[PDB]
Write an enzyme that holds these catalytic residues in place. Structure first.
Site, short mmCIF file in Angstrom:
data_model
loop_
_atom_site.label_atom_id
_atom_site.label_comp_id
_atom_site.label_asym_id
_atom_site.label_seq_id
_atom_site.Cartn_x
_atom_site.Cartn_y
_atom_site.Cartn_z
N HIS B 41 0.93 -1.35 -0.05
CA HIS B 41 0.05 -0.08 -0.20
C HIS B 41 0.66 1.32 -0.01
CE1 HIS B 41 0.93 0.83 4.21
NE2 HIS B 41 0.53 -0.30 4.54
N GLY B 143 3.90 5.93 9.43
CA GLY B 143 5.34 5.88 9.07
C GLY B 143 5.88 4.38 9.60
N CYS B 145 4.96 1.55 9.34
CA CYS B 145 4.49 0.72 8.10
C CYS B 145 5.98 0.16 7.49
CB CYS B 145 3.46 1.22 7.39
SG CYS B 145 2.14 2.22 7.91
#
Ligand SMILES: C[C@H]1CN(C(=O)Nc2cncc3ccccc23)Cc2ccccc2O1
Ligand SMILES: C[C@H]1CN(C(=O)Nc2cncc3ccccc23)Cc2ccccc2O1
Lengths: 303, 303
Positions: B41, B143, B145
């Site tokens: 994503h 962030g 992620c």
């Protein structure tokens, strides 16, 4: 979101852990530049640790009696000297993995990360706080002596702790990297009293702010005086809250929009009324191992 | 002695964290050999995350639309492919700091260490457990992620987790390193129900053994059937205790000299009678983020 007890990245400190052998005793050391730092009671046998004369024992030791291993590599020791309770072994090789580092001595209540090591190899890392009575409730086994505590300030490793000893209580004592013990402790196996431990009040307040930031808010309500809450804190063996402590809690107060005194009022009834079986951030007790800077490091995600 | 929630040394994983930029979105990646692993994503804008068609969105993207930064170094992307929910970006350079590593998929209840990162730089490390409902109560900001969970098995890093998303509850969901989500979750911002979470019973029992090893013993007493205690566990939303769970608790049973069933009897009254205001290993709740192997790793000090 979410709040965990978080330790610094231990990579830069891993590259400085050595194995130090003297006689039969083996413990961990810290190799920075061409010097290896380790606890001085490595030169002791088990009969020596009852009451060692470290000057007389070190005088019988020579550079070749010191086996410094850096992984499979083994370093040549070309000098030795005793600074307080640490031994400083000068070696021929400078550590290529030496980070930008400082030696600092923290005050009580300040937190740091511990890289627990055995035979110079890392095993784990955890976050802990220097108790007001200058001990730490750590996780140390026989051989963890020489492991270091540290903080990282953007690519700069600030060493503040070297583990020396277990007290008969099961808690732990150590020194700074210059050899001076935190607290009234001596590297010698006798009965040693740690003082009355108190709760780091400024840390509990920073931890309640982290809960408000993360959604748990049931403990909020009153206000109170600094003087009035300190008398509440004194009865519950919390260390008094000074004005500088209020000042450091400013940014958390401005982000949360809750005055420091209102939070002290909410904590004072937490102390007088317990927790009624509830939890704050998943903990049924009041956590005091987070400094106000620890809380905003995690809530801001500094790297 | 002493018992802390201990994370693996994060050094070997630090050298594999990259910064991945696509469009305006930026998250963390994992650079092993000449491949960079990151959540897929990253190719999404904020309007895309409501319901993204990842095939259609990736088709508009080319290798030069991917900015992979390795510290100050920036790597050339020469290939890309979507494996489930991760993107695999092939780069011209192989990572010189690649450790010996495996990709594994843990089962619920198993624990691991998380290296929380932002813009490819490490910020902290903490130990956590894969909840029975395949979530983790972590510490993740916008962030984080792309950060990874891992275990270290003597110089071999076993990657098991890549963080993808925050659920509206405030807990977190992710995948293995092959892209398959733990649980019934999809990388898309909608309402997503995590199942009923249960307590990892085998972990609580291993944690009570660690307390006996460390001196706290007040909770010991009775015995009970496996079947009878499971019915106690079912009422308190503890996951049932199988015979393999008893088998894995064998070494702790032999070291402690306390049969597994006697410990289940001591826990069953811990469940029915609360804790009366006392603490076990400094915790007023029953800890379930220590596996039986975690406990003997720390009590043995494996490196
Ligand atoms: C023998 C000499 C050297 N010391 C250690 O070897 N200390 C230890 C450090 N960490 C974990 C330990 C776990 C169990 C036993 C000792 C441990 C410090 C020390 C501790 C306790 C009593 C005396 C004493 O003085
Ligand atoms: C927008 C898209 C991409 N995602 C993130 O950016 N997730 C985050 C990961 N970690 C910490 C976070 C803290 C605050 C907000 C998001 C966080 C996952 C996600 C989470 C929540 C809702 C939707 C969603 O889908």
């Amino acid at each position: 979101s979410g709040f965990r007890k978080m330790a610094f990245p231990s990579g830069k400190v891993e590259g400085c852990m050595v194995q130090v052998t003297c006689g039969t005793t083996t413990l961990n050391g810290l190799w920075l530049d061409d010097v290896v730092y380790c606890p001085r009671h490595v030169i002791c046998t088990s009969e020596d640790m009852l009451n060692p004369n470290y000057e007389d024992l070190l005088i019988r030791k020579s550079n070749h009696n010191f086996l410094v291993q850096a992984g499979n590599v083994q370093l040549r020791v070309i000098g030795h000297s005793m600074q307080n309770c640490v031994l400083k072994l000068k070696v021929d090789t400078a550590n290529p993995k030496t980070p930008k580092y400082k030696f600092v001595r923290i005050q009580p209540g300040q937190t740091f990360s511990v890289l627990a090591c055995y035979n110079g190899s890392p095993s784990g890392v955890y976050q802990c706080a220097m108790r007001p009575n200058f001990t730490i409730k750590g996780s140390f086994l026989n051989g963890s002596c020489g492991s270091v505590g540290f903080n990282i300030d953007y690519d700069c490793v600030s060493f503040c702790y070297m583990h020396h000893m277990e007290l008969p209580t099961g808690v732990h004592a150590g020194t700074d990297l210059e050899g001076n013990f935190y607290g009234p402790f001596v590297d010698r196996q006798t009965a040693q009293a740690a003082g009355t431990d108190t709760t780091i009040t400024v840390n509990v307040l920073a931890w309640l702010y982290a809960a408000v930031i993360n959604g748990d808010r049931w403990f909020l309500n009153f206000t109170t005086t600094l003087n009035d809450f300190n008398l509440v804190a004194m009865k519950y063996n919390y260390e008094p809250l000074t004005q500088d402590h209020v000042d450091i809690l400013g940014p958390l107060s401005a982000q949360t929009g809750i005055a420091v005194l209102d939070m002290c009022a909410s904590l004072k009834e937490l102390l007088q009324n317990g927790m009624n079986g509830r939890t704050i951030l998943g903990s049924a007790l009041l956590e005091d191992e987070f400094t106000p800077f620890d809380v905003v490091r995690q809530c801001s995600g500094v790297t």
